[PDB]
Design a protein around this ligand. Sequence first.
Ligand SMILES: CN1CCN(c2cccc3nc(-c4n[nH]c5cc(-c6ccc(N)cc6)ccc45)[nH]c23)CC1
Lengths: 256, 255, 255, 297
Amino acid sequence: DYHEDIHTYLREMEVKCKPKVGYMKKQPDITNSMRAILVDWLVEVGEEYKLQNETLHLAVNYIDRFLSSMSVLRGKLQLVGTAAMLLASKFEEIYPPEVAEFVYITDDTYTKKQVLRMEHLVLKVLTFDLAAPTVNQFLTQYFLHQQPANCKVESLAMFLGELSLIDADPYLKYLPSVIAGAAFHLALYTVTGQSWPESLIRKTGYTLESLKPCLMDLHQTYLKAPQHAQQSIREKYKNSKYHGVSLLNPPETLNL
Amino acid sequence: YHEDIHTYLREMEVKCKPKVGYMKKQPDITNSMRAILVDWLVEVGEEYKLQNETLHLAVNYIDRFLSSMSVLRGKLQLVGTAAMLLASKFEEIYPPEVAEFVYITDDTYTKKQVLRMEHLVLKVLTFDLAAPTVNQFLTQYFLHQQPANCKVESLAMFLGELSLIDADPYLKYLPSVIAGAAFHLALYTVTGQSWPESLIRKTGYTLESLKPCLMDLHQTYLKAPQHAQQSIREKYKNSKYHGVSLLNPPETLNL
Amino acid sequence: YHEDIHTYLREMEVKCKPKVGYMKKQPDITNSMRAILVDWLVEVGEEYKLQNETLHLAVNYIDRFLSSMSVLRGKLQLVGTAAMLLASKFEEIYPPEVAEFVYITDDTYTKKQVLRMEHLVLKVLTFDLAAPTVNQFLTQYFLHQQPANCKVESLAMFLGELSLIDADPYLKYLPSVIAGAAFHLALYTVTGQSWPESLIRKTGYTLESLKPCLMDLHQTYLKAPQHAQQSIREKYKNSKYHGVSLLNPPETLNL
Amino acid sequence: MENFQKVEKIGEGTYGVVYKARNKLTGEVVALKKIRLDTETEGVPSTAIREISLLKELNHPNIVKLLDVIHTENKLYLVFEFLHQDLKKFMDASALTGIPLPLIKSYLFQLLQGLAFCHSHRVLHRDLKPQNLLINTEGAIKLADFGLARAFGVPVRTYTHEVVTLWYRAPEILLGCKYYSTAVDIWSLGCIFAEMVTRRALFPGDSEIDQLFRIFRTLGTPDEVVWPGVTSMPDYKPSFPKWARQDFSKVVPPLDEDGRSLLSQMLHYDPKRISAKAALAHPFFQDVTKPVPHLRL
Ligand SMILES: CN1CCN(c2cccc3nc(-c4n[nH]c5cc(-c6ccc(N)cc6)ccc45)[nH]c23)CC1
């Protein structure tokens, strides 16, 4: 009834919530590597405080949009992320960690006042537009088209989608809906040997052809995951809650 | 005999035509001045509680008179006064006495002048006073309402009366055609319905054939609040006309 | 760079669009009230010898402001005053001081109010004041005259200025299109010629594509003497505009 | 805030007050919700964050417009369109006569259109009660107070705490379901519909168990045939009394055959409960008009 309308609406809103793909080049003091470290650290903080995966995804979306129009010095990058996680928790969590907790995780590198002032600044810069579509939301929507449900597939899809958050190059240039579609297919193929189903092709209008470029990148990220400098997500997804899916070996080829 | 009468009215409306381009051939007066005159005649009709038909007849008389007679701007109102007097005598059960018509002109003209102009207009029109009007055709069309709707009738009459004000473009349409456009446009505005098949059969006019007049009428309707002459709008915001001049026009006719 | 600029103006006119239907969503004010305001701004421009561009900019600012802000009838003139002040600062070499704008409002508003409204309009328009206008497009078109004709230029400007008065229908046309129709109609009226091939190539607009706007503009032109608002006609009967508002419109465009 | 004249307090809340106000430059009458910012302890409240961010995506004639957000030093103001009173006070004013049925039909129709729009935009209101529903003299009704509202592109988790005053709370919530669905908003609207018709709360429970039992007594104690899964739900007890479903003709006497059918579909136990969109297509609304209320101001 309404999950068609909601998917449609999410497809409309994800085109509007886009950050600038090339923002990191126009940024004098910070780099993709530094962003990678920040996002990896946000994964830890989410595990430390038992935060929803959606909160992580929202926070990253907020950071990329903030950095798309604001120059930040390396010593303030973490303050942006903290404020972003704080705002994402307030939006998404039933009860978010208090502000003092967010000051805590930064090892007193920033003050309560700084964090609260950065919260105001990020709200201004984002113009209170916090309800951004994420890879998480599209995956959730796609999981309803599983014949039948498979928790190992869902956990691996979520693992790959979460890995996409770490590397701005190349994942900033793909829509959440597309990254979701690639993560779903890749997980589905790895666990059950099946492919992007015809029901999802009708729902999303994406073919396996159209997902190929993103699929290519995601497969390569999946193969290199054990060598990546950032490891918090692999560690997170070797837990029993996620069926240890970060230990599943990726296929060496995709046969497209 | 209602068929015989429509048929006869259709015959006579082609013969009572004034010259469409007479105002160009007229040295001292303009369409704007005519607009002012007709608007004033609407007020006079409201002041003396005259029938709508009397207004329509008077304007027909004025256009035919001006089609063959040059008139100076200072005498245009004397022509209208005499025309309204003659139309009242023809159409009203008891017309206002001549002194009444002299007084609405603020003593700009004398009783003798008005009575002499009456004679001149009768001569120039050759006593042919029983002219068909938009009013008469609307009245005949209203008998093909399934069922009657007083708000439609009032708005049709409002639009038909607005057509009297602007010689350009309405002098080049027959009363039967203006009536047809006014009926459709009012019907469409109030009830969303269109020129009915019963009237298509009676009149032979399609919605295609009414289109040119309809587009002008629609444009007049949209611009009515901005028109310099406002006596008709004011008249039709009364309860007797269900305040139809305050209704919003359609943005499109979807023809 | 005259090509680069036309191209850039064509890009920006699509972005500076107000909401076409904003007046419906507006509780206390109407198109008629807007017509009165714009007509008054024409007088103010004549009183203070302001450029035509300043008038066009001010109206653009007012429509965009009213597209996102509800205003009561008693504050509509304060919006226009602040808009005219801002347009003068943007466009005039030396604008009238703020006290001057307070005085043309007959002390209905205070200096503080006008200065506060200036701030509010800047906020609501996000300092985006360099809007494309009919005036700017006409000026660019005038460079494709073979050869120049000041009577055509004046009449084109007259028609373009008339389009500012009536939100319905002119809010739904781009300035480039209104400009194109005004140029053709003026050119046709004075010299009998039509929208030239050089401008067809430059603008990509055919005479077919201009037709809807052209028919509205022609209709506005024909009814100009009857319009309740007359400041533009009065302005364009001056010698500086070769009395072009007294020229007779074409009875037909023969399209 | 310099261009706003405070007219009067019209509402008191947890994070702040609501004032009737006037734009001094435009004359626009507005509702200003003031939020005091404790800038040591908490920052911008979660209620404001959700309310602002979700409401600015929701432009609809049956949802109260957020006009502006004036965010400054130590104050946050939300500027809304001004309406004339809430449905609760209107119901109280209409006690010796009822709201006429055509106005009830109109109000439900508009509330469903507002709700359908929310749901199509993945927003759950979660707090539909008569005092959160605003009316004007022209016959409009709109959804207000989106402080508890939530985006559900990801399913929204149930609380232990804080929620929907007891009387409009849906059975699944009372029986401790894990996730909200859009059905909870439809349930509340059903209760409000019945209340307008009968002039009394449908299920005025003194407590959670008392609230459940009042629902059971009217609608019947649900079983696995009526609601597949009930008996496995966290707060379900086999010791629950087994009441029979009674006639809707006695629960809502003034309603016709179509009205009863719509209400029963809105109060369906299994969250098979009618959608807002499906409810709008119900034959109950095949003659809906837009009457104007007698607001005793
Ligand atoms: C408890 N009641 C409520 C109605 N109160 C009231 C009485 C009389 C006139 C009133 N006008 C309002 C009002 N207009 N617009 C509003 C918007 C919100 C809003 C606030 C938050 C959100 N998210 C959306 C809209 C709340 C209240 C109002 N409320 C009024 C009396 C006390």
